[PDB]
Design a protein around this ligand. Structure first.
Ligand code: DMA
Ligand code: DMA
Ligand code: F3S
Ligand code: F3S
Lengths: 309, 309
């Protein structure tokens, strides 16, 4: 059985920065360090940090006074940010710069009292944080997940309307939502294409290439990782059995039973060590040396705040 | 005399990467290493690299077969890229990712055969490279520098039009041109605001804050550096005497005599050592300890290609 590895795969710049922020905070201030929401959606990373003294909570009311709190890479609403500010807490923001970018556009629309539409998945922390940047009652902030949602949305004034998107969506599905938005609201303004980040776009391009060669695709990533789910979904849509797994232990023999070529990739929040263990398991199951496919080279790095070096 | 330092100032992520590409190529392959055009618009940087074995040329035809060629941070046209590709040369592209980003949009428009308008300064290498991404004869690629140029522009189809901008322009001036574009071509499409990079936006924001306290502003940068000139221009437009200088040696006593507060900043292509030397010179001219102003933190880094690390 041939083992192919998608390229690029794994850690993006926002995730590496976010994890480093927590690790450095722990090294500088020692345990415990509070983090609002899993720093990144990866069980291994979260479990490891917890073992190191990090405490993950969902609400600021779960954080003691005088404590150190870090916002996850997914970002937080202004309400959450203000609640933390009103509290006696030292705050470090690990929100990815590319999520913050969208936040600023929403804040701008809110200040102008102009309505905005966000394309994203309800319930996701990034959506909650981004929609949470809009506060002007005279305007409006709406969420749409599909063309159907666009088809039934009504706004106060479509002459002054803008849109933004979640950073980890399916490039193809989002394109369809945007087409619908422009057909429905011809005067709507937004980015050239979307707010989907480079890492998401690159990994989806990479898994598409992997899928046209592999019969089965394994995506290393946790169940609550949006970008990871989109990778598995993309492969499945291409007619390939694709599985989202946290570690090599989740691999079932039947999945690669008599398979001549299996492909492996990883979400933006999955550590390389997990991929290495998955490859080792596949090799125990008959796979040969892992072959990395040629791909788009990534060179972006986001540094931790000087205050945490 | 009080010395204030703008923040941020100096090296951006694109320049740091570009210089590192030339330095590492030299370290790995040794001299000579050929570079098309100045890697960055800074006399000191170019002179230093030349002293290290880099040979700056104007046309790829000046480069011998089997040699190593590097494209400057400003980018190159498709014609130049294809010329190098057909040659027996090892090519490393130091084009800044943020310039490449704009290149991609122009190529996209050319593919669709839709006309594009670039806001930029004629003669600049970045403009040459970006307009050089448009090839479709059925479309069109136009350059505009002012609102006036927009008023006089004639296009084939105003229904299918898009715009892009140079990365180092004046944020305020470009805003004026864009306002004119949308007023003239209501259906024109483009980015939310412009293609001015974070570094340019941040340095202009920083010099604005500096000029509010300083009576005189020294901008470290070469005469052919677009972003550097915009910093000096911004300070001068605020009513402060501004000087664009290559190094401490250019400082004239008369410029700062009796001056109570002098501010110092540097363009994206100027090394920090030059700023340190300028501060030293100002100190022997009566200046005190240099005081860094508080500013927007930058955390972006662009790694050199894996082959050159
Ligand atoms: C945009 C972002 C913060 C990505 C990090 O990956 P993740 O799996 O932790 O988050 P997501 O669920 O958005 O893919
Ligand atoms: C966009 C870019 C490559 C900036 C680097 O600075 P530079 O002085 O070398 O070039 P520019 O003339 O565009 O400011
Ligand atoms: S938005 Fe940021 S954290 Fe990762 S997947 Fe995208 S870079
Ligand atoms: S476009 Fe790139 S090289 Fe510097 S000034 Fe801007 S980052």
């Amino acid at each position: 059985m041939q083992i192919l590895l998608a390229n690029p795969r794994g850690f993006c710049a926002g995730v590496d920065r976010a994890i480093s922020i927590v690790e450095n905070a722990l090294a500088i201030y020692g345990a415990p360090i509070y983090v609002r929401h899993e720093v990144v959606h990866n069980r291994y990373v979260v479990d490891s940090l917890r073992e190191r003294g990090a405490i993950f909570i969902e609400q600021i009311s779960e954080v003691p006074d005088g404590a150190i709190l870090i916002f996850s890479a997914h970002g937080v609403s202004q309400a959450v940010r203000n609640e933390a500010k009103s509290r006696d807490l030292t705050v470090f923001d690990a929100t990815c710069p590319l999520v913050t970018k969208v936040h600023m556009e929403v804040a701008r629309a809110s200040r102008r009292g102009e309505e905005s539409i966000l394309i994203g998945h309800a319930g996701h922390p990034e959506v909650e944080g981004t929609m949470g940047q809009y506060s002007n009652p005279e305007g409006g902030m709406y969420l749409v997940e599909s063309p159907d949602d666009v088809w039934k949305l009504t706004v106060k004034n479509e002459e002054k309307l803008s849109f933004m998107t979640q950073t980890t969506l399916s490039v193809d599905d989002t394109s369809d939502v945007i087409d619908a938005l422009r057909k429905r609201f011809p005067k709507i303004v937004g980015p050239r294409k979307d707010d989907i980040c480079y890492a998401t776009t690159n990994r989806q391009e990479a898994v598409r290439a992997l899928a046209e060669q592999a019969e089965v695709v394994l995506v290393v990533g946790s169940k609550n990782s949006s970008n990871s789910n989109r990778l598995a979904e993309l492969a499945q849509r291409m007619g390939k059995r694709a599985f989202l797994i946290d570690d090599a232990k989740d691999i079932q023999e039947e999945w690669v039973k008599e398979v001549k070529c299996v492909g492996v990739t990883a979400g933006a929040s999955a550590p390389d060590i997990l991929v290495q263990n998955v490859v080792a398991r596949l090799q125990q199951l008959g796979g040969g040396e892992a072959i990395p496919l040629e791909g788009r080279e990534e060179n972006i790095v986001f540094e931790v705040p000087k205050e945490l070096r």
